[PDB]
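Consider the following input, taken from an annotated entry for Thiol:disulfide interchange protein DsbA (Escherichia coli K-12).
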Amino acid sequence: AQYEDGKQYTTLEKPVAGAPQVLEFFSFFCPHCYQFEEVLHISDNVKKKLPEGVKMTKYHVNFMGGDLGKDLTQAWAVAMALGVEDKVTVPLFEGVQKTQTIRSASDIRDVFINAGIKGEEYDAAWNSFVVKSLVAQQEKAAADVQLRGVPAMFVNGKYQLNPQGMDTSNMDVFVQQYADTVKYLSEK
Ligand SMILES: Cn1nccc1CN
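Applying the prediction step yields:
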């Protein structure tokens, strides 16, 4: 077959019911996640190939980067709560991995301030139970799949993308294979 269980994707032995349609996990400490975001634009290219009926979710993980990694999961909850993901993703990746200027929770906050989020608004969100609930949702979704690595993408709590077998000589072809695989899996 063109798409084969075990090749372009794997099938979870323990399927997760009630899972998001398309669920991505990442860490701002994760080098391939940096590539997925600013080099490949995986999420946008996946979105462009799905109908308006399939929704996309993207969650941060705790298991990379120690204390700061956990701070970044809470900051990502702030980004989701305020709807400013598109404003802070590139600066957070650059701050962690390129300039290495993000070393503390205050340095994370600075990225939001520079992106135009008011300080009192960031602080209110950071300390809010709405954000605490989003942190809990991110942790529970990762735990449901016993997640041990990023980047990772899951379709309908049933299928996990397997990019390792794909040709990476051309980046545009790789991204297209990835998105077409997500589309195929979403249609199963
Ligand atoms: C710098 N910082 N971090 C959290 C709260 C404050 C002061 N507004």
